[PDB]
Amino acid sequence: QHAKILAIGTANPPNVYHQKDYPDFLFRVTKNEHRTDLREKFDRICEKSRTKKRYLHLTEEMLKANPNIYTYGAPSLDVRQDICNIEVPKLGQEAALKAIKEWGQPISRITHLIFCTASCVDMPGCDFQLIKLLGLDPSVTRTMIYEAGCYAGATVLRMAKDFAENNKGARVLVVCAEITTVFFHGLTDTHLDILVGQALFADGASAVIVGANPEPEIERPLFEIVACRQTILPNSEHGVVANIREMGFNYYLSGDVPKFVGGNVVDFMTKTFEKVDGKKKDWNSLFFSVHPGGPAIVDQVEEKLGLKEGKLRATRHVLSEYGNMGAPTVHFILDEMRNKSIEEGKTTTGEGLEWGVVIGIGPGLTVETAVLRSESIRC
Amino acid sequence: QHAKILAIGTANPPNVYHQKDYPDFLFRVTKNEHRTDLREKFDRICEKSRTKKRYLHLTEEMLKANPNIYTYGAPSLDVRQDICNIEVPKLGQEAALKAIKEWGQPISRITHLIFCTASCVDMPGCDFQLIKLLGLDPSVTRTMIYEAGCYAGATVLRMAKDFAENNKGARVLVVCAEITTVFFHGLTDTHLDILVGQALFADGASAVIVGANPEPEIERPLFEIVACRQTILPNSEHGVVANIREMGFNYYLSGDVPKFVGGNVVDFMTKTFEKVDGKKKDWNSLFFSVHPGGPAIVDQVEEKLGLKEGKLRATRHVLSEYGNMGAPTVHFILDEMRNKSIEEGKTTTGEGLEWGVVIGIGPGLTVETAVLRSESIR
Ligand SMILES: CC(C)(COP(=O)(O)OP(=O)(O)OC[C@H]1O[C@@H](n2cnc3c(N)ncnc32)[C@H](O)[C@@H]1OP(=O)(O)O)[C@@H](O)C(=O)NCCC(=O)NCCNC(=O)CSCc1cc(-c2ccccc2)on1
Ligand SMILES: CC(C)(COP(=O)(O)OP(=O)(O)OC[C@H]1O[C@@H](n2cnc3c(N)ncnc32)[C@H](O)[C@@H]1OP(=O)(O)O)[C@@H](O)C(=O)NCCC(=O)NCCNC(=O)CSCc1cc(-c2ccccc2)on1
C-alpha cells in the first residue's frame, strides 16, 4: 500500500512579468541602460528561454527603496530576508489551502508537514510559521528542508512517501515555496550567470497531500509514489552552486549543466527503474514531470531518451507560463498534466499512461527521480 | 522490527576552554575589559552554568585576523561561512569514522545520510561535502537539515527511524555537527542574551548508524527507537530565536525557557508514552538523555517529573565536560550512558533499565521526544 498524492494546489505572487517586457524592465530599474553589451546578451537568452511570463513578488518600488539589491555585491541579505521570511510562508499558505480544499479532509487530520524553500532561512522556520497561519495541530511532525535547490521537488515526495508509509494513517502536507527576491542581483560582465537566472527564475508555491490507504468516498488519489532514487552526476560539482552571503544568495550556473544531464539521463533512468521492473528502453511509454531548469535541460532529456514530439508538453507548458520556480515546478507540472488529462478525457491523470517519473535536478549535480503510477480520473 | 542505533561516535575541536578562564579570555580578546558591568554579569552566568569546559574551533588568532566577528553588528557572515562551511563537514567526518568503526561494516553499505547543522548553510550542502570526504556511494539517499536548532538531535533519530523501517536493508548514517563561530558576538548592554550564549554554547559532532533488523553476530544494537513525537509549547515563540543576518547568526534567549519546559514536561512525556503503551509510566523507571540547553532546563525536567537524585547524571556530565553543543549533545549523552553502564557492569546500555527517552528542545519552543529501549551489553 504505497503512498499516494491525494491533492495538489499551487499559488504565485500577483505581479506578472511578460518576458517580452522583462529586458526593458530589468535594465531600466537597475540603472543599466548603458550596458548595451549586456542587453544584447540578455535579449538572446530571453529569446531562447522558452519562458513567456513569470510571477514575481519583487517590485520596482522595492528596488527603489533598497537599491543595494541591484548593486552587485553590496550588503543586502538582511532586507532580502526581512521580505522572504514573511512572504515564503504566506505564499505556501495559499497553495496549502488549495490542496487542503481538494483533499477534502479537516486540517486536524494532517499529521506531518514538510516545508521546503531555498529562498530564506530562519529559526523558528517556515514550517513553524505555516503551522501558525493554517492552524495545524501543534504536534504535527515537521521536516524543514532549507536550501536544497532544484532537485527537491522530487526529494520531498520521497520523504513524504517514507513518512506516510511508515506511520499508519499519516497525512503529510508538503509545501514548497520560492520567492526569488533573495537571488536577484545586478549586472556585471564578471558574473554573466546572473543573466541566465534573471531570464529564468520565478516565484511560486506548491502544496501536495500525501497519504497511504486513501479513505473511500472522501479521498481520491492522483498519483502513487512507487520508488525513488537520488544520485550525484560524476564530475559536475561546479554545475550549480549557491552561497548564502552578505550580498544575498549568490549563484553560479555552468553552461555544461544540460550536457551533464543529457550524458547521464539514460543511466539515471535505468538505475531508477531497476528498483521497479528493470525497464531500460522505450521511454515513450512513460509520462514525465521534468524539472525545467532551463530549456536546454528539457531538450537534452527529450533527445537522449528518444522522446517523441509532445511527450514533454506539460513540462514545457509550465516553463512557458511560469518559468523555473525551483522545487515546486515539478508539482505544477503534475497538476498541469492532471488538468490536461481531464480536458482530453484521458483514462488516467498521467496522460492516460500507467507509469511515469518526476526528475528533479539541482546542486551536485544531484538528480532525484520518483517513479509514479497514475490514477483513474474521478471526483 | 524497529530501527536500532547500531553505533555512536563523537568528536570535538582540539582547543579546550576551561570555564574558569573564559571570562578573562572573552573580555581580553574582544577589547571589553573596561566593561566592568558586563564582566560581573558574565561572571555570575558562568558560575551558574554548570559547564566546566568546552571545545571550540574559534581561536584568538582568528578573532585578531577578523575583528568584525567580535564587533557587535558588523558585517561578518561571509568570513564565518567561509570557516564553518569547511569545518562543519570535517568535524562531522571525524565523528562519522568513529561510528563506522564501531558499526564494523563497509562504508559502501550505507544507503542513507542525514546531516544536521545550525552552524552554516551552502549549496551543495554539508551532506554533499561529507559524501566526498568519506567516499559514500554517490547514490546515497540524503536529508540535509539546516538551521533546525536544539531539538534536532531527537528529530534526526525520528527521521532515521522512518527511513530505516520503510526501506528493507537500509543503513542510515546520521551526522550532527556544530561550530559556533557563526554565533559568536561581541558585548553590548542592549543585547545581554549574548552573555548566556557566550557561557554555554560549544562545538561538537555526533554520528549514529541506524538500521532495522541487525545482522546477528555482525551488528550489535545499542538502543531501539520505538516512537517519537514533536510538539510546540504554547505561547513560547519568543523563547529561542535565531536569525541569519549580515552580522552572522544572531540569537535571542528568553529567561522563561526553563519554566516553559517545566510547565510542559509532564504533558509531553505523557503524550509521547501514550504512543507506546496505555499504562501510566513511572518516570523514575526510565533512562534519560535531555538536551541540556542550560542547567536550569535540566533542573526543570528533574523537578516536574519527580526524578530521584542522580537520574540525570549522564546529562549533567556532558553539560559539565562539553557544554551545550546543540543537536549532537543528546547523542553524546547516550554515548556517555552506554560507557558508564559498561563501567558499572549494568545489564543494559540504559543504566540497567529497559525504557528511556531522548528530549530535544529548541526554537518554537519545539520539543521532540524519542522513546528508546536499551539493549543488552554485548
Ligand atoms: C540559458 C539558455 C536558456 C540559453 O539557450 P542555449 O544555451 O541552449 O543556446 P546558446 O548557448 O547558443 O546561447 C545562449 C547564450 O547564453 C550564454 N549562457 C548560457 N548558459 C550560460 C551559463 N550557465 N552561464 C553563463 N552564460 C550562459 C551562452 O554563452 C550563450 O551565448 P554563446 O555561447 O552563443 O556566445 C539555455 O542554455 C539553458 O536552458 N541553460 C540551462 C540553465 C541552467 O543551468 N538551469 C539550472 C538552474 N539552476 C538553479 O536555478 C539553481 S542555482 C541558484 C538557485 C536558484 C534557485 C531557485 C531558482 C528558481 C526559483 C527559485 C529558486 O535555487 N538555487
Ligand atoms: C542562564 C542560566 C545558566 C543562569 O543560571 P541561574 O538560573 O542558576 O542563575 P540566575 O538566573 O539567578 O542569574 C543569571 C543571570 O543571567 C541572566 N540571565 C539568565 N537567563 C537569561 C536570558 N535567557 N537572557 C538574558 N539574561 C539571562 C539573569 O538575569 C542573571 O543576571 P544577574 O542579575 O545575575 O546580573 C540558567 O538560568 C539557565 O540554564 N537558563 C536556561 C538557558 C537556556 O534556555 N538555554 C537555551 C539554549 N538555546 C540554544 O542553544 C539555541 S539559541 C540560538 C542558537 C544556538 C544554537 C547552537 C547552540 C549551541 C551549539 C550549537 C548551536 O542554535 N541556535
Side-chain angles (χ1 to χ4, degrees), chain A residues 75-79 81-82 118 121-124 128-129 131-132 138-149 151 155 158-159 161-163 165-167 229-232 237 240-246 363-364 366 368, chain B residues 75-79 81-82 112 118 121-124 128-129 131-132 138-149 151 155 158-159 161-163 165-167 229-232 237 240-246 363-364 366:
Chain A
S76 57
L77 176 66
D78 291 351
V79 293
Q81 284 267 76
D82 290 341
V121 56
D122 202 31
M123 290 163 65
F128 176 89
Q129 301 298 348
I131 286 163
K132 198 167 157 175
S139 303
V140 287
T141 296
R142 300 131 61 188
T143 300
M144 187 47 259
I145 302 301
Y146 273 130
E147 281 74 65
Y151 52 85
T155 300
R158 176 255 293 177
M159 295 169 175
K161 170 184 174 66
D162 280 352
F163 300 158
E165 288 173 5
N166 204 48
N167 295 277
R229 185 163 192 274
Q230 192 173 36
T231 197
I232 294 160
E237 183 178 345
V240 178
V241 171
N243 311 129
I244 292 73
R245 310 295 283 170
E246 292 163 33
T366 293
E368 182 128 26
Chain B
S76 54
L77 176 67
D78 293 346
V79 295
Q81 284 265 79
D82 288 344
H112 289 71
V121 58
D122 203 26
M123 295 171 84
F128 176 89
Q129 300 300 347
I131 288 163
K132 288 181 41 157
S139 299
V140 287
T141 294
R142 298 131 62 190
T143 300
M144 179 61 246
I145 303 302
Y146 272 128
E147 283 73 65
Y151 52 82
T155 303
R158 175 253 292 179
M159 302 163 171
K161 170 182 172 71
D162 285 345
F163 303 155
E165 287 176 5
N166 203 50
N167 295 277
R229 180 176 174 270
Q230 192 174 35
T231 199
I232 292 156
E237 169 167 5
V240 175
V241 168
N243 312 127
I244 290 69
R245 305 298 276 179
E246 294 162 24
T366 294

Side-chain angles (χ1 to χ4, degrees), chain B residues 29-78:
Chain B
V29 306
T30 70
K31 323 291 201 188
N32 281 303
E33 286 179 333
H34 63 283
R35 302 303 310 272
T36 45
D37 44 347
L38 293 187
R39 175 56 185 267
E40 290 181 47
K41 294 203 184 65
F42 192 56
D43 284 346
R44 298 298 85 67
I45 289 163
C46 285
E47 289 175 357
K48 297 294 180 249
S49 70
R50 305 281 298 271
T51 298
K52 183 182 82 163
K53 66 190 221 300
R54 290 177 283 164
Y55 301 88
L56 301 171
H57 169 85
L58 189 59
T59 62
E60 182 178 355
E61 278 299 332
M62 289 172 217
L63 289 182
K64 281 166 91 183
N66 307 273
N68 52 334
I69 291 176
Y70 68 79
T71 305
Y72 184 87
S76 54
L77 176 67
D78 293 346

Side-chain angles (χ1 to χ4, degrees), chain A residues 123, chain B residues 40-42 44-50 118-119 148-150 178-180 183 192-196 199-203 239-242 249-258 291-299 324-329 361-363:
Chain A
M123 290 163 65
Chain B
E40 290 181 47
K41 294 203 184 65
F42 192 56
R44 298 298 85 67
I45 289 163
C46 285
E47 289 175 357
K48 297 294 180 249
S49 70
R50 305 281 298 271
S119 289
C150 284
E178 301 295 344
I179 300 283
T180 61
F183 291 105
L192 291 180
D193 312 43
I194 298 309
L195 296 183
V196 174
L200 286 172
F201 296 170
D203 295 0
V240 175
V241 168
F249 291 15
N250 197 26
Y251 60 90
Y252 297 93
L253 306 168
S254 174
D256 278 355
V257 169
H291 178 64
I297 285 168
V298 180
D299 292 341
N324 172 3
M325 286 169 299
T329 311
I361 308 168

Side-chain angles (χ1 to χ4, degrees), chain B residues 89-199:
Chain B
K90 179 170 139 178
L91 189 66
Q93 172 191 21
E94 190 190 329
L97 287 170
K98 291 170 181 182
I100 289 161
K101 181 192 172 176
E102 171 176 3
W103 178 41
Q105 292 296 122
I107 289 182
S108 61
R109 184 74 184 73
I110 296 165
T111 59
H112 289 71
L113 170 62
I114 301 178
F115 200 112
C116 173
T117 185
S119 289
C120 60
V121 58
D122 203 26
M123 295 171 84
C126 294
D127 61 318
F128 176 89
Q129 300 300 347
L130 187 68
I131 288 163
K132 288 181 41 157
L133 288 168
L134 289 178
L136 289 169
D137 188 321
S139 299
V140 287
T141 294
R142 298 131 62 190
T143 300
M144 179 61 246
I145 303 302
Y146 272 128
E147 283 73 65
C150 284
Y151 52 82
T155 303
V156 295
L157 296 178
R158 175 253 292 179
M159 302 163 171
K161 170 182 172 71
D162 285 345
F163 303 155
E165 287 176 5
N166 203 50
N167 295 277
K168 178 160 191 206
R171 292 288 182 271
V172 186
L173 171 62
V174 181
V175 176
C176 294
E178 301 295 344
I179 300 283
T180 61
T181 287
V182 75
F183 291 105
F184 184 105
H185 297 289
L187 311 182
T188 165
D189 63 33
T190 73
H191 192 180
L192 291 180
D193 312 43
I194 298 309
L195 296 183
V196 174
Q198 282 284 0

Side-chain angles (χ1 to χ4, degrees), chain A residues 20 39 48 66 108 114 148 150 158 163 174 176 184 190 200 202 229 285 348:
Chain A
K20 61 187 192 70
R39 175 60 184 268
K48 293 187 191 88
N66 305 281
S108 62
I114 302 176
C150 280
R158 176 255 293 177
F163 300 158
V174 182
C176 295
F184 185 106
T190 72
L200 292 165
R229 185 163 192 274
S285 73
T348 80

Side-chain angles (χ1 to χ4, degrees), chain A residues 5 20 66-67 132 172 201 215 245 349 354 359 370 376:
Chain A
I5 292 174
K20 61 187 192 70
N66 305 281
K132 198 167 157 175
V172 186
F201 298 170
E215 181 158 8
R245 310 295 283 170
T349 53
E354 187 62 20
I359 306 175
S376 300

